[PDB]
Amino acid sequence: STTIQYNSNYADYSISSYLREWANNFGDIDQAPAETKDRGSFSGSSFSGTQYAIGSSHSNPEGMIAEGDLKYSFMPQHTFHGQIDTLQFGKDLATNAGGPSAGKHLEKIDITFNELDLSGEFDSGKSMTENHQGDMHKSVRGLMKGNPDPMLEVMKAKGINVDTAFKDLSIASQYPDSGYM
Ligand code: NA
Secondary structure, three states: OOEEEEOHHHOOOEHHHHHHHHHHHHOOHHHOOHHHOOOOEEEOOOOEEEEEEEEOOOOOOEEEEEEEEEEEOOOOOOOEEEEEEEEEEEEEEEEOOOOHHHOEEEEEEEEEEEOOOEEEOOOOOOOHHHHOOOHHHHHHHHHHOOOOHHHHHHHHHOOOOOOOEHHHOOOEEEOOOOOOO
């Protein structure tokens, strides 16, 4: 079953209010010029990986990391598919020691969704419209475009309450208070 951890600074936020703030600041990747666009980084495999990590293309700190079995179809349909088990949001993505093939991490982790079971399929013979209806694609691509609503709809359809503040949300627990951030 999906569970959540959150940094105490976000105790008064909900999933919906957090993802709105995150996505607004991440901003729409399509509006970034090519020269400064972060298209995201796959690692863990020899356009696929067990981790996909992406930061804002607009010189803001927001970033996201997905872990699971992730794939991207590139040209011409640009569909994200596979399985996301863990989805994490925060700020200031950095490459792990050993470089990009070792993965990335967020310097500040705000919210982590565990056992999210977010999936989608890709069929190379089907239309782009059909392939883009998958839960994983619409939610990840929406977030990349500054739009959390597809992700929120997927979460609501899983029975997750995206309205409750984290402090009151049964499936969420606060990361222990620390002092290094
Ligand atoms: Na709670």
